[PDB]
Amino acid sequence: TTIAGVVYKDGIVLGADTRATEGMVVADKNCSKIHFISPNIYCCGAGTAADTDMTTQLISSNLELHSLSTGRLPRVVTANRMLKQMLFRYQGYIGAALVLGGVDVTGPHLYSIYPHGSTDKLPYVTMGSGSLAAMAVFEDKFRPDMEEEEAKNLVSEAIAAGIFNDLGSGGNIDLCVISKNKLDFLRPYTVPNKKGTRLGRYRCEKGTTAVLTEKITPL
Amino acid sequence: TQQPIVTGTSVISMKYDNGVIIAADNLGSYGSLLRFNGVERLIPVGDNTVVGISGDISDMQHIERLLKDLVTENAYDNPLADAEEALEPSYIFEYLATVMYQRRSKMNPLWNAIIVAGVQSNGDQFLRYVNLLGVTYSSPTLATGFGAHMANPLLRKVVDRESDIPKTTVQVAEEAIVNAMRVLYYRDARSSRNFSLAIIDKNTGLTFKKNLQVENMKWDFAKD
Amino acid sequence: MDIILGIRVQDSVILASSKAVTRGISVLKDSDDKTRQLSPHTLMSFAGEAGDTVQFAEYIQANIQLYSIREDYELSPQAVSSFVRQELAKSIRSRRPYQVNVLIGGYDKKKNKPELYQIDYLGTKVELPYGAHGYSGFYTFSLLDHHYRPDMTTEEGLDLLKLCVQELEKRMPMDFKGVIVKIVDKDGIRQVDDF
Amino acid sequence: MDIILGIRVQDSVILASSKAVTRGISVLKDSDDKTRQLSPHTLMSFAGEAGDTVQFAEYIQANIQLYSIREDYELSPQAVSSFVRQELAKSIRSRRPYQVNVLIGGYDKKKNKPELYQIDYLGTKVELPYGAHGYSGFYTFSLLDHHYRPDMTTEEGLDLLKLCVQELEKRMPMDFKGVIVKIVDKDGIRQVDDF
Amino acid sequence: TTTLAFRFQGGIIVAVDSRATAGNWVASQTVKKVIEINPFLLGTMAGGAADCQFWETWLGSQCRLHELREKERISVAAASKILSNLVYQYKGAGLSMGTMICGYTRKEGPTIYYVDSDGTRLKGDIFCVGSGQTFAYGVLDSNYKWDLSVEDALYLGKRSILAAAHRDAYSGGSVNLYHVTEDGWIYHGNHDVGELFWKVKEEEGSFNNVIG
Amino acid sequence: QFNPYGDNGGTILGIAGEDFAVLAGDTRNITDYSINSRYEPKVFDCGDNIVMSANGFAADGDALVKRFKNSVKWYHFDHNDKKLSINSAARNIQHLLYGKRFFPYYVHTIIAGLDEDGKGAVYSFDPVGSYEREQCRAGGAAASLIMPFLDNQVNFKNQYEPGTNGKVKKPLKYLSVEEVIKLVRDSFTSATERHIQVGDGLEILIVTKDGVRKEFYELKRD
Amino acid sequence: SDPSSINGGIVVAMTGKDCVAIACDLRLGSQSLGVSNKFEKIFHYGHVFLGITGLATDVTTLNEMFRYKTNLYKLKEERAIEPETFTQLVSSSLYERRFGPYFVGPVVAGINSKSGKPFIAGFDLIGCIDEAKDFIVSGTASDQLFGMCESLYEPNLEPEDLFETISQALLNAADRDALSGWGAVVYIIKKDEVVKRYLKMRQD
Amino acid sequence: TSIMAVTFKDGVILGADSRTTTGAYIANRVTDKLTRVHDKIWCCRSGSAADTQAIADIVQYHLELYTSQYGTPSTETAASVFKELCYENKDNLTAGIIVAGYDDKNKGEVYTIPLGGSVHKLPYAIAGSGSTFIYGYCDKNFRENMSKEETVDFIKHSLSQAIKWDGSSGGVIRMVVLTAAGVERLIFYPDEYEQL
Amino acid sequence: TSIMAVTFKDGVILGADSRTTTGAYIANRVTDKLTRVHDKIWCCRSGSAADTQAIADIVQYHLELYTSQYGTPSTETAASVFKELCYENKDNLTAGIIVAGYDDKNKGEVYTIPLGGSVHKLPYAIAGSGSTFIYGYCDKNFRENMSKEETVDFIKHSLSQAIKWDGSSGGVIRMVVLTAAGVERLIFYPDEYEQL
Numbered sequence A: 001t002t003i004a005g006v007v008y009k010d011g012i013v014l015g016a017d018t019r020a021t022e023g024m025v026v027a028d029k030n031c032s033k034i035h036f037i038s039p040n041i042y043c044c045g046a047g048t049a050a051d052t053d054m055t056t057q058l059i060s061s062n063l064e065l066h067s068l069s070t071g072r073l074p075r076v077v078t079a080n081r082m083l084k085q086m087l088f089r090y091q092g093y094i095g096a097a098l099v100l101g102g103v104d105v106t107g108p109h110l111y112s113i114y115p116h117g118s119t120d121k122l123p124y125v126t127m128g129s130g131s132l133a134a135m136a137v138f139e140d141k142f143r144p145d146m147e148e149e150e151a152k153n154l155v156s157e158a159i160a161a162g163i164f165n166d167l168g169s170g171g172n173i174d175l176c177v178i179s180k181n182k183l184d185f186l187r188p189y190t191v192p193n194k195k196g197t198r199l200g201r202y203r204c205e206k207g208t209t210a211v212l213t214e215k216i217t218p219l
Numbered sequence B: 001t002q003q004p005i006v007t008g009t010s011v012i013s014m015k016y017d018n019g020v021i022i023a024a025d026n027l028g029s030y031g032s033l034l035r036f037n038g039v040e041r042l043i044p045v046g047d048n049t050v051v052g053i054s055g056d057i058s059d060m061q062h063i064e065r066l067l068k069d070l071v072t073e074n075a076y077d078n079p080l081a082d083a084e085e086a087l088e089p090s091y092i093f094e095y096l097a098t099v100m101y102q103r104r105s106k107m108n109p110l111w112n113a114i115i116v117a118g119v120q121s122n123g124d125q126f127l128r129y130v131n132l133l134g135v136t137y138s139s140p141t142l143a144t145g146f147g148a149h150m151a152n153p154l155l156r157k158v159v160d161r162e163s164d165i166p167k168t169t170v171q172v173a174e175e176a177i178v179n180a181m182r183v184l185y186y187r188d189a190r191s192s193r194n195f196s197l198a199i200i201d202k203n204t205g206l207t208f209k210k211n212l213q214v215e216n217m218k219w220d221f222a223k224d
Numbered sequence C, D: 001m002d003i004i005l006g007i008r009v010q011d012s013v014i015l016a017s018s019k020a021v022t023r024g025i026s027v028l029k030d031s032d033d034k035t036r037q038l039s040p041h042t043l044m045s046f047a048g049e050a051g052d053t054v055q056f057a058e059y060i061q062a063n064i065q066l067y068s069i070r071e072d073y074e075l076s077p078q079a080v081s082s083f084v085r086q087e088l089a090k091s092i093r094s095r096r097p098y099q100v101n102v103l104i105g106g107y108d109k110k111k112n113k114p115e116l117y118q119i120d121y122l123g124t125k126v127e128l129p130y131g132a133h134g135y136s137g138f139y140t141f142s143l144l145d146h147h148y149r150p151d152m153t154t155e156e157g158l159d160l161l162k163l164c165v166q167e168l169e170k171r172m173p174m175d176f177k178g179v180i181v182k183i184v185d186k187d188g189i190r191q192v193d194d195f
Numbered sequence E: 001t002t003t004l005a006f007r008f009q010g011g012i013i014v015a016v017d018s019r020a021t022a023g024n025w026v027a028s029q030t031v032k033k034v035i036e037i038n039p040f041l042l043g044t045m046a047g048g049a050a051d052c053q054f055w056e057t058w059l060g061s062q063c064r065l066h067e068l069r070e071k072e073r074i075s076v077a078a079a080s081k082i083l084s085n086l087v088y089q090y091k092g093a094g095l096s097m098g099t100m101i102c103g104y105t106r107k108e109g110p111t112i113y114y115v116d117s118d119g120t121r122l123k124g125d126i127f128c129v130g131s132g133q134t135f136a137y138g139v140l141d142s143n144y145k146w147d148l149s150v151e152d153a154l155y156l157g158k159r160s161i162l163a164a165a166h167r168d169a170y171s172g173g174s175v176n177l178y179h180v181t182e183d184g185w186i187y188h189g190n191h192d193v194g195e196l197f198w199k200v201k202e203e204e205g206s207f208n209n210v211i212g
Numbered sequence F: 001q002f003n004p005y006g007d008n009g010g011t012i013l014g015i016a017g018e019d020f021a022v023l024a025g026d027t028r029n030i031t032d033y034s035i036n037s038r039y040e041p042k043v044f045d046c047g048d049n050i051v052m053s054a055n056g057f058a059a060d061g062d063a064l065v066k067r068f069k070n071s072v073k074w075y076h077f078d079h080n081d082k083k084l085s086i087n088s089a090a091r092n093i094q095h096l097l098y099g100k101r102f103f104p105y106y107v108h109t110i111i112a113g114l115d116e117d118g119k120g121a122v123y124s125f126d127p128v129g130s131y132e133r134e135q136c137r138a139g140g141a142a143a144s145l146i147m148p149f150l151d152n153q154v155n156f157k158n159q160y161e162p163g164t165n166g167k168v169k170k171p172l173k174y175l176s177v178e179e180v181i182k183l184v185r186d187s188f189t190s191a192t193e194r195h196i197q198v199g200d201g202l203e204i205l206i207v208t209k210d211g212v213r214k215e216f217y218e219l220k221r222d
Numbered sequence G: 001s002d003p004s005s006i007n008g009g010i011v012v013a014m015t016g017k018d019c020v021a022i023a024c025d026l027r028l029g030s031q032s033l034g035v036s037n038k039f040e041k042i043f044h045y046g047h048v049f050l051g052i053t054g055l056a057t058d059v060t061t062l063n064e065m066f067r068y069k070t071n072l073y074k075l076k077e078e079r080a081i082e083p084e085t086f087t088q089l090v091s092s093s094l095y096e097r098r099f100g101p102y103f104v105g106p107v108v109a110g111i112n113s114k115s116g117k118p119f120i121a122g123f124d125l126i127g128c129i130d131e132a133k134d135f136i137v138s139g140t141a142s143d144q145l146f147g148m149c150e151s152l153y154e155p156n157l158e159p160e161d162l163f164e165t166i167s168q169a170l171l172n173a174a175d176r177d178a179l180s181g182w183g184a185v186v187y188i189i190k191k192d193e194v195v196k197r198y199l200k201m202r203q204d
Numbered sequence H, I: 001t002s003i004m005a006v007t008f009k010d011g012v013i014l015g016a017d018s019r020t021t022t023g024a025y026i027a028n029r030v031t032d033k034l035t036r037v038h039d040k041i042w043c044c045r046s047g048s049a050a051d052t053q054a055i056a057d058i059v060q061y062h063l064e065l066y067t068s069q070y071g072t073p074s075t076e077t078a079a080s081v082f083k084e085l086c087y088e089n090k091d092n093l094t095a096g097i098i099v100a101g102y103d104d105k106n107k108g109e110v111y112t113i114p115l116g117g118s119v120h121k122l123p124y125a126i127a128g129s130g131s132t133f134i135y136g137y138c139d140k141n142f143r144e145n146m147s148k149e150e151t152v153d154f155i156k157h158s159l160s161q162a163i164k165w166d167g168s169s170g171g172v173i174r175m176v177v178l179t180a181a182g183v184e185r186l187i188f189y190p191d192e193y194e195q196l
């Protein structure tokens, strides 16, 4: 996985690849790793995929109930706290490594959350097996207060670095652009690899397989 | 079997149109202690080869002596020692590769990752890797340890495949290498600001640059 | 405990179960019945860790006997086997799991059919024409693969079972001191006293 | 290999040795003779690790047979036992020790006396009226303590040995497939073919 | 793996499966587990594939040097002991070898020796070696008698491998059959279990545990 | 503790035709999640119309290929420039591999060429030198992804003729070099899509009576 | 020792044009010992099908558990559960044993009764959802099935074309696995008919 | 990590580097290790980031609730709350925390809480992996009742050396000044401190 | 142990503490860790006492035999002999040795040989357990071409701090001065250096 986020002038740009692996095998070439927390907050996910999925869903659910009671949009700090305090309580056994990004009443905020319950508040972050490839792109080219289409390109370039150079990462590039005026969920943003074309048709003709018995039941 | 004690970090390198560039920082770490700040880890052999070495420094110093001794030995009864029968990058590499794999196979490895960069007799760029296991590979960009994870991604954007080598000038390649050395300094906890860089060109020969420094450092976003 | 076999023929289920009880160096007993009658037409043989085997078998027996009194009815072999599997499947994630493997041989009075269930200590249930637990099956299944037919009589079942026990007596290293055999059919459970 | 017994009576030595050869799960053979004739009036039974047993026995046999040819003379049972003990005592501090235990039953033609030596894989030699290796002795020595007399006949020795084998067949867990019995007396070595 | 060999009225039958595994990975189903040492000697292979193939090929070379040196066919007893004394030298180094040396000579008649990597060397009339030995032993032991014809013996050996091919996960592929007589060994075919199983089921009326 | 072995990934594939053979391999070399090279050749022409690959731990592979190439050279010297037949090469490799029985060459070795009757041959070795002639063999990381497909498409396994319903098997018709190359490329395309260690490039060496030819194809680089 | 490969076996599912297919082998073993060749791994709760590979006691337990849950679902909701909804139920149920999981590899297959859309899904043992359109594989020969499916599969197959694809994928993958095979079953599922076929395969 | 707190005439100054590593990878090079638990009570954090963050948040909570009921807490009280958490959960924590604060009554105060959960009140304190390298330097150069500029230079020079030798430390030197005047945040970049 | 060698204008000075511990017991409090391998080539020893004594005796032998045949050896040559032993026997040795010597041609030279068996030529070197505490101090206070009195004070102050913080170090500070003038042994007691 290669997940990344940057803080730009108007808000936040999040990025992710789409490769889901079981060991060395690719189970899904186009899976979603940018999760919904609240309408103004999203979460990129790496580490143990189940932990990532159910931790984001639980905090999203609790924030929805929080937001219904208060009547106002939730903040990134509260999403950050709720994720943080839970992951800390489980002492690293919930293997969720998140890039949390959103836009508050108090402006745009970006966090990295680690399985053990530490969080860093940063202008750019990367996580997953492709974090070093992606971070190289950010150290090379990041600057504060970027324009939107520039930040989009930098994140896309950082995810691409992960896709190609890291074996754990691959597939398409998903982005999520968050500002005060809009939320753009771009899936896919880019398709850097074409699906490999097959030269032969290996599908068998009808009656090729040997059947013993058959049963038909209508519904 | 041993364990490495005093260590050197990333050696990075790439091919360009006429030759090769190689670089490495001047640090000898002693675990987390940044112990020795004046360690040269690029070791030139003749005027056509530079051997860049990472890992255990005592084993590097052993390899340095082996190469120094190799030059002496090649000169013996060799009237063409400075001409047709000079040491080639490919010869120097193959020797080291033989040594590295022999040592791993006696369960007593030289605890290093080595990149041999040079230019051959016929002008061909030579760039090949070997490590403590005797594992060898070549690529338009090569980097050891930490640089494999951070330097290669940046350097591969300049030379992504073989066909990009003739399109890459020495200025573009050297900029890329120096850029990568900056990125490594920000992010590698066992690196240093001071480094050495070596260009081996088929026309301009061996250029060895000492006491370089990482500059243009973006820290201003920290204050917020 | 060592060898427990089972074979379902036309109109009955036959359970053969070794007599030896060995604790380490010495054979303490050569006449041990490794079985409990759960209900009049359902028999369970068992083998596994010392203590756990009988404790489990007697616990299952007590529960089925309670059900029988409460409802004035005999549970089907399928129902008893499902109950037993759930008890083992519950057991496996306990603090201390029951290390007990079982065969449940029963005659379903409703369907007029013999039924043989093989369940291991994990709660792995399978209905079979013939079954075994532990190393026994390594020798015996190939015999039964060869010789078994679904329409066999109870006497043919007993002959096929002798052939299994002879093969085990020839090729197994432990002296299991022969087997007690029991037949489960429409008329209930009876012990073949000469084998 | 499992059970090897020995009993020295009035005018002979009798060695009983199990017939089973088991490799893990299966009994590969039920007619194995765990003995070698070292000389015409000296027999060695053996038990221990696979391979090592026969290799050691055959190696000892070859050496004693060489001595016999060189000197045109049979070594005394005492001398053969001392040779064997030294070979084992040498073995125990080797790179890979012989894991072999032995009984040497011999008739000393000079003294007109039967002699039984028990030697373990460490080179621990003892002359005995009756001996055993491994777990056998735990059952058999108490029988022999009770029933043995030094003036017994060879037939009385064989009866006392049947009582040992029956007790082992009753109380030992492993099926050792009966014993081959051999008598060592003034007239040499012969096998009791019915036991 | 399932290898068997047994002695009867009209010679020796040798039957083997053809499957090679690396854990649960079926690496091949067309493997040769019988080595033809000479026109009168066979070797079966169980345990480590290399350790058998190598040392039994090497055995064949040592059997040749014997008959060059001594102008006489090597005895089965001697051939088997070359291999057993060899493996014994490597004892504790982790060779994995369960083998059968089957052959005929005028001196000893038909003879089978079991030899394994931990030094054991045993003469006998019936042996089954491999992860599926127990399955083969079951069928073989319960249909065996000296009496048997060459047609029935061949079939019983074929069938006893099929038995183990079915139940044992690490056995299968095909059955390679051999018949050893006074005149030498005779190959009796490669029988794919894919087709043999359904044929044997139909014709014999066995394998009723199966849907088909 | 020092571990003398490593895993350089990679995947190789040998297929024996009627009068030809192919030995293919991906050109990616890796350690863990890093790519070392996108083009590091793995399948080698060894002379005498024999092609070889020793996939696995690249150092042990390089060592073995080097030793075999040298074995070919010394066979010429010692036996009056006689051609090393593929079967003789195979047995020679068994002894090379078994020589290191107690400290193995951690590789799956495959050779390909022509037998002495001019027919296509592939031989396949485990790390300690057990070997056999085979019609079809994939080795390395994605071998489990490729072999079932080859059972199905080369040997027509589980395939029967329409209308007969399991009674008549699909007949075992011979595959041309163009047909085999399609299977190789598509096997590697599939393996590249589903295995993370497979990609970058595919290099195929084709052996016929006319000699050893090469073909190269791009593979997906992520 | 490894609970996911004691008993053995496989499941594969595929989508086609207005149809899905799910298939499984019939083996149950204790490692090398084959025990049963009638151990089916595909179950159904209404029109939603669930394949489960792995430790057989958990396969059985989960089937019984999802029957339980889907029955109560139907009584309360007054309608049969849909594949999308069930998939979420499986994921929830697996994840609630996060630190003592069921050693299983479930696979959902079915057609959404309202939209008519063919649906498949897969899970790891702790409930992460593999949500792929093309195919889902599971079991001891999953690698083998991945290879077979990737090369054989193509989108929008007609029911009897898809049957030949999924069957050949299962059979050839199983024959390269020691712990899979001993028979096989293939369900071809359409919006209002389901065809269940048993396959003839080698019995070793 | 390299962290220190130093009392001086007008109050107290906390100082820290900004490097956080995962082995040899610098995960965060602009880390803020000086965290606020009350207006003029701050702490320097070393050890597990998850543990020291979790503790500092709990302390902030306790002191917020203390302030609601009993007014501004003493620096000693803050140190006692830190200690109570660190000592009672010593088996499950890896936290080395320096607590520093300004009262008007007590002026500047520094409390160090090492791994055990013991408390030590000191004129200055040093901690973190990089602190080993500057025990010699800090002992020779520290004086009591320094001026603000002297104390900034003492901390800057000390952490400059800690950074130079410790690979685990690096980046910018952050400082936080605590006096009657208020709270001042200072930052010093590599180009400034490396040439000292 | 706390040891150092420092080059200066007139040559080089070696310095060492005198404590040798067996765990917490001070086995020898008046240890001489400055050992002579040649007239004006000495070494500071840290690590296993058995190993460093054994090495120093072998080196002394080699240089004695060198001197018999080829005249006075260079300080570089001495360091090479130490290295050769330490590097080739790295698996069986625990020796951290500083080699210091005075030629007339080369003047003062210092070579450090850490655990690996690598060699490093330096203007000054520090080593031993107590050296960690004075990296900061020594880097800030060392200058090249110091006078004899300045270098004695630099070493005295440095080892004074090393001793203060390191329990493994202590006792007297021994020094050995190597110049053209000859070889001078200095000693400094606790009552002198502790009050610095």
Ligand SMILES: *[C@@H](CS(C)(=O)=O)[C@H](Cc1ccc(CN)cc1)NC(=O)[C@H](CC1CCCCC1)NC(=O)[C@H](CC(C)C)NC(=O)c1cnc(C)s1
Residues within 6 Å of the ligand: A001, A002, A019, A020, A021, A022, A023, A027, A031, A032, A033, A045, A046, A047, A048, A049, A050, A052, A053, A127, A128, A129, A130, A168, A169, G123, G124, G125, G126, G128, G129, G130
């Ligand atoms: C990339 C993270 S990486 C390579 O840096 O660890 C992805 C992140 C991700 C996030 C969300 C989704 C969709 N909900 C998919 C993927 N992570 C993975 O692919 C997981 C990587 C594993 C690395 C080894 C340690 C476990 C995590 N893979 C999984 O979580 C898979 C689930 C897929 C969908 C089948 N589970 C396993 O591989 C497991 C094996 N054994 C387990 C207990 S979980």
Ligand SMILES: *[C@@H](CS(C)(=O)=O)[C@H](Cc1ccc(CN)cc1)NC(=O)[C@H](CC1CCCCC1)NC(=O)[C@H](CC(C)C)NC(=O)c1cnc(C)s1
Residues within 6 Å of the ligand: E001, E002, E019, E020, E021, E022, E023, E027, E031, E032, E033, E045, E046, E047, E048, E049, E050, E052, E053, E096, E130, E131, E132, E170, F104, F125, F126, F127, F128, F130, F131, F132
């Ligand atoms: C069945 C014997 S069994 C299941 O009872 O152990 C076969 C016997 C056999 C005999 C001859 C030939 C001729 N080429 C092939 C096969 N044995 C095997 O399939 C080996 C099973 C191993 C199980 C674990 C104990 C060692 C034996 N398989 C191997 O020897 C394989 C052979 C490959 C798949 C071709 N090699 C490995 O397992 C290796 C793994 N790592 C190595 C360095 S070698």
Ligand SMILES: [Mg+2]
Residues within 6 Å of the ligand: E165, E166, E167, E168, E169, E170, E171, G034, G178, G203, G204
């Ligand atoms: Mg099977």
Ligand SMILES: [Mg+2]
Residues within 6 Å of the ligand: F192, F193, F194, F195, F196, F197, F198, F199, F220, F222
């Ligand atoms: Mg790929």
Ligand SMILES: [Mg+2]
Residues within 6 Å of the ligand: G174, G175, G176, G177, G178, G179, G180, G181, G182, G204
């Ligand atoms: Mg199969």
Ligand SMILES: [Mg+2]
Residues within 6 Å of the ligand: H163, H164, H165, H166, H167, H168, H169, H170, H171
């Ligand atoms: Mg630093």
